[PDB]
Structure 1
Amino acid sequence: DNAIAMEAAHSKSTEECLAYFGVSETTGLTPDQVKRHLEKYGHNELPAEEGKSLWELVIEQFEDLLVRILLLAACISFVLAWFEEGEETITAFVEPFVILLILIANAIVGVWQERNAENAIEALKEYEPEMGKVYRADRKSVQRIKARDIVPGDIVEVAVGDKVPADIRILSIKSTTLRVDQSILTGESVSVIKHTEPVPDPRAVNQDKKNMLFSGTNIAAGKALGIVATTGVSTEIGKIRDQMAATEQDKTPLQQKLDEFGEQLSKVISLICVAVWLINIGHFNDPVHGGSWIRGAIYYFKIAVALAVAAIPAGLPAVITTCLALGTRRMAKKNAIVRSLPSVETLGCTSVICSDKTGTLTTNQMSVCKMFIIDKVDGDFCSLNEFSITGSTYAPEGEVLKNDKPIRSGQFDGLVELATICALCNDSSLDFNETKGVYEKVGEATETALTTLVEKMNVFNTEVRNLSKVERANACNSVIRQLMKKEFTLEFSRDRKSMSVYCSPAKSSRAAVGNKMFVKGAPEGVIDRCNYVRVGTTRVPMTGPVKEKILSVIKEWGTGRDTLRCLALATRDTPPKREEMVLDDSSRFMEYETDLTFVGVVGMLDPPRKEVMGSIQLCRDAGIRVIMITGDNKGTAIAICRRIGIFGENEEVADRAYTGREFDDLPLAEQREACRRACCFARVEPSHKSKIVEYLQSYDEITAMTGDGVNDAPALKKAEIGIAMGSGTAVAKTASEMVLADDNFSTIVAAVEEGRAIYNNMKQFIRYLISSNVGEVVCIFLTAALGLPEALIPVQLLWVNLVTDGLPATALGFNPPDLDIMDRPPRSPKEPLISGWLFFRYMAIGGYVGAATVGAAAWWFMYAEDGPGVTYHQLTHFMQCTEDHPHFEGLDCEIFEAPEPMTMALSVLVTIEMCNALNSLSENQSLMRMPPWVNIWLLGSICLSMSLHFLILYVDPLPMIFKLKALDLTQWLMVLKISLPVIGLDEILKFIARNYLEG
Structure 2
Amino acid sequence: MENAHTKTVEEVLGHFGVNESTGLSLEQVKKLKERWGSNELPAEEGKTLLELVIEQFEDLLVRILLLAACISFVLAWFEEGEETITAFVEPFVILLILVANAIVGVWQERNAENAIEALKEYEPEMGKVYRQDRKSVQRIKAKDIVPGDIVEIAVGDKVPADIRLTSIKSTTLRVDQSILTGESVSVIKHTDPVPDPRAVNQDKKNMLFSGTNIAAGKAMGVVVATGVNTEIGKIRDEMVATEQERTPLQQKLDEFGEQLSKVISLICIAVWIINIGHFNDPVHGGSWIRGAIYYFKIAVALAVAAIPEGLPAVITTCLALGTRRMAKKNAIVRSLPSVETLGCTSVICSDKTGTLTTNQMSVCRMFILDRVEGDTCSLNEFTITGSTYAPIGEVHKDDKPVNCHQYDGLVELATICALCNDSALDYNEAKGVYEKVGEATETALTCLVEKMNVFDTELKGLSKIERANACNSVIKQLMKKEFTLEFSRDRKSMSVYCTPNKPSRTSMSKMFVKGAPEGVIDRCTHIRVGSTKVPMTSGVKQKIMSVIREWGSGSDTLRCLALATHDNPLRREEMHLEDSANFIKYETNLTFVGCVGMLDPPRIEVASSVKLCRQAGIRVIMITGDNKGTAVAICRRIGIFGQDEDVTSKAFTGREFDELNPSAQRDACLNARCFARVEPSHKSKIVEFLQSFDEITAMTGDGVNDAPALKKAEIGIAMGSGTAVAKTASEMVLADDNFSTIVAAVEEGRAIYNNMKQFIRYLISSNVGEVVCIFLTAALGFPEALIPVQLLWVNLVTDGLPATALGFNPPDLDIMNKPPRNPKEPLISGWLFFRYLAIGCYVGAATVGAAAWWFIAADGGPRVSFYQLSHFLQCKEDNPDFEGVDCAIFESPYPMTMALSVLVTIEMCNALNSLSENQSLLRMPPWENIWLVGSICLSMSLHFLILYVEPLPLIFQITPLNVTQWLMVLKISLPVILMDETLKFVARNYL
TM > 0.5 fold call: yes
Give the Cα–Cα distance (whole angstroms) in 2 for the partners of residues 176 and 866 of structure 1: 91
- Is the CA contact (8 Å cut-off) linking 1:529 and 1:595 kept in structure 2? yes
**Alpha-carbon distance, 1:461 to partner:** 4.1
Give the Cα–Cα distance (whole angstroms) in 1 for the partners of residues 609 and 453 of structure 2: 40
Give the Cα–Cα distance (whole angstroms) in 2 for the partners of residues 754 and 314 of structure 1: 27
Aligned match of 2:395 = 400
* 3-state SS of 1:984 partner: helix
Aligned match of 1:353 = 348
Aligned match of 1:68 = 60
**Alpha-carbon distance, 1:625 to partner:** 2.6
**Matches of residues 190-209 of structure 1 in structure 2 within 5 Å?**
none
1:862 aligned to 2:838?
Answer: no
**Matches of residues 645-664 of structure 1 in structure 2 within 5 Å?**
645-651=639-645
**Alpha-carbon distance, 1:310 to partner:** 1.1
- Is the CA contact (8 Å cut-off) linking 1:185 and 1:710 kept in structure 2? no
**Alpha-carbon distance, 1:96 to partner:** 2.7
Give deviations 1:660-703, integer Å, cap 9, x for gaps: 66667789898777655554455655566556555544544333
Aligned match of 1:895 = 889
Give deviations 1:740-768, integer Å, cap 9, x for gaps: 33333322222222222222222222222
1:269 aligned to 2:264?
Answer: yes
Q: 1:912 to 1:530 in 2, by over 3 A?
A: closer
Aligned match of 2:816 = 822
**Matches of residues 588-667 of structure 1 in structure 2 within 5 Å?**
596-634=590-628, 636-651=630-645
The TM-score normalised by the length of structure 1 is 0.76
Give the Cα–Cα distance (whole angstroms) in 1 for the partners of residues 615 and 470 of structure 2: 50
- Is the CA contact (8 Å cut-off) linking 1:276 and 1:781 kept in structure 2? no
Give the Cα–Cα distance (whole angstroms) in 1 for the partners of residues 628 and 922 of structure 2: 56
Aligned match of 1:885 = 879
1:912 aligned to 2:906?
Answer: yes
Give the Cα–Cα distance (whole angstroms) in 2 for the partners of residues 95 and 708 of structure 1: 58
Q: 1:529 to 1:356 in 2, by over 3 A?
A: closer
Give me the CA root mean square deviation. Answer: 4.7
**Alpha-carbon distance, 1:802 to partner:** 0.9
Give the Cα–Cα distance (whole angstroms) in 2 for the partners of residues 294 and 94 of structure 1: 24
Aligned match of 1:179 = 171
* 3-state SS of 1:69 partner: coil
Aligned match of 2:946 = 952
Give the Cα–Cα distance (whole angstroms) in 2 for the partners of residues 740 and 461 of structure 1: 43
**Alpha-carbon distance, 1:452 to partner:** 1.1
Aligned match of 2:732 = 738
Aligned match of 1:384 = 379
**Alpha-carbon distance, 1:793 to partner:** 0.8
1:311 to 306, 311, 315: 306
Q: 1:712 to 1:90 in 2, by over 3 A?
A: farther
1:441 to 436, 439, 452: 436
970-979 or 580-589, which deviates more: 580-589
- Is the CA contact (8 Å cut-off) linking 1:119 and 1:735 kept in structure 2? no
* 3-state SS of 1:953 partner: coil
934-943 or 487-496, which deviates more: 487-496
Aligned match of 2:754 = 760
Give deviations 1:699-722, integer Å, cap 9, x for gaps: 443333434566555554554434
- Is the CA contact (8 Å cut-off) linking 1:178 and 1:193 kept in structure 2? no
Aligned match of 2:521 = 527
* 3-state SS of 2:717 partner: strand
685-694 or 95-104, which deviates more: 685-694
In structure 1, stretches of 5+ residues that fail to align are: 1-48, 128-158, 165-172, 187-191, 197-210, 224-232, 236-240
* 3-state SS of 2:958 partner: coil
**Alpha-carbon distance, 1:382 to partner:** 3.3
**Alpha-carbon distance, 1:245 to partner:** 8.9
Aligned length: 868
**Alpha-carbon distance, 1:989 to partner:** 2.4
2:495 to 482, 494, 499: 499
Aligned match of 2:40 = none
Give deviations 1:17-47, integer Å, cap 9, x for gaps: xxxxxxxxxxxxxxxxxxxxxxxxxxxxxxx
**Alpha-carbon distance, 1:896 to partner:** 1.3
Q: 1:486 to 1:119 in 2, by over 3 A?
A: same
Give deviations 1:810-862, integer Å, cap 9, x for gaps: 22223222222222212222222332223223312222221121112122222
Aligned match of 2:929 = 935
Aligned match of 2:802 = 808
- Is the CA contact (8 Å cut-off) linking 1:336 and 1:741 kept in structure 2? yes
- Is the CA contact (8 Å cut-off) linking 1:249 and 1:718 kept in structure 2? no
Q: 1:541 to 1:195 in 2, by over 3 A?
A: farther
Q: 1:795 to 1:762 in 2, by over 3 A?
A: same
* 3-state SS of 1:91 partner: coil
**Alpha-carbon distance, 1:525 to partner:** 4.1
**Alpha-carbon distance, 1:453 to partner:** 1.0
Aligned match of 2:19 = none
**Alpha-carbon distance, 1:265 to partner:** 1.8
Give the Cα–Cα distance (whole angstroms) in 2 for the partners of residues 913 and 162 of structure 1: 57
Give the Cα–Cα distance (whole angstroms) in 1 for the partners of residues 302 and 288 of structure 2: 21
Give the Cα–Cα distance (whole angstroms) in 2 for the partners of residues 731 and 430 of structure 1: 26
The one-letter amino acid paired with 1:328 is: T
**Matches of residues 775-854 of structure 1 in structure 2 within 5 Å?**
775-854=769-848
- Is the CA contact (8 Å cut-off) linking 1:193 and 1:491 kept in structure 2? no
Aligned match of 1:962 = 956
Give deviations 1:874-908, integer Å, cap 9, x for gaps: 21112122374332022432321112111111111
Give the Cα–Cα distance (whole angstroms) in 2 for the partners of residues 293 and 222 of structure 1: 86
Q: 1:778 to 1:524 in 2, by over 3 A?
A: closer
- Is the CA contact (8 Å cut-off) linking 1:630 and 1:681 kept in structure 2? yes
- Is the CA contact (8 Å cut-off) linking 1:184 and 1:710 kept in structure 2? no
- Is the CA contact (8 Å cut-off) linking 2:698 and 2:717 kept in structure 1? yes
- Is the CA contact (8 Å cut-off) linking 2:654 and 2:682 kept in structure 1? yes
The one-letter amino acid paired with 2:810 is: P
Aligned match of 1:35 = none
Give the Cα–Cα distance (whole angstroms) in 2 for the partners of residues 604 and 845 of structure 1: 64
Give the Cα–Cα distance (whole angstroms) in 2 for the partners of residues 750 and 600 of structure 1: 42
* 3-state SS of 1:440 partner: strand
Give the Cα–Cα distance (whole angstroms) in 2 for the partners of residues 556 and 501 of structure 1: 31
The one-letter amino acid paired with 1:95 is: V
- Is the CA contact (8 Å cut-off) linking 1:707 and 1:723 kept in structure 2? yes
**Matches of residues 201-280 of structure 1 in structure 2 within 5 Å?**
216=212, 220=218, 250-275=245-270
Give the Cα–Cα distance (whole angstroms) in 1 for the partners of residues 772 and 514 of structure 2: 80
**Alpha-carbon distance, 1:782 to partner:** 0.8
1:337 aligned to 2:332?
Answer: yes
In structure 2, stretches of 5+ residues that fail to align are: 1-42, 127-149, 156-164, 179-185, 191-204, 222-230
Give deviations 1:123-174, integer Å, cap 9, x for gaps: xxx99xxxxxxxxxxxxxxxxxxxxxxxxxxxxxxx998999xxxxxxxx99
**Alpha-carbon distance, 1:195 to partner:** 12
Q: 1:599 to 1:185 in 2, by over 3 A?
A: farther
* 3-state SS of 2:881 partner: helix
782-791 or 110-119, which deviates more: 110-119
The one-letter amino acid paired with 1:972 is: W
What percent of counterpart residues are identical? Answer: 71
The one-letter amino acid paired with 2:380 is: N
1:550 to 544, 554, 576: 544
Give the Cα–Cα distance (whole angstroms) in 2 for the partners of residues 83 and 341 of structure 1: 51
1:567 to 554, 561, 570: 561
686-695 or 977-986, which deviates more: 686-695
The TM-score normalised by the length of structure 2 is 0.76
- Is the CA contact (8 Å cut-off) linking 1:618 and 1:822 kept in structure 2? yes
Aligned match of 1:724 = 718
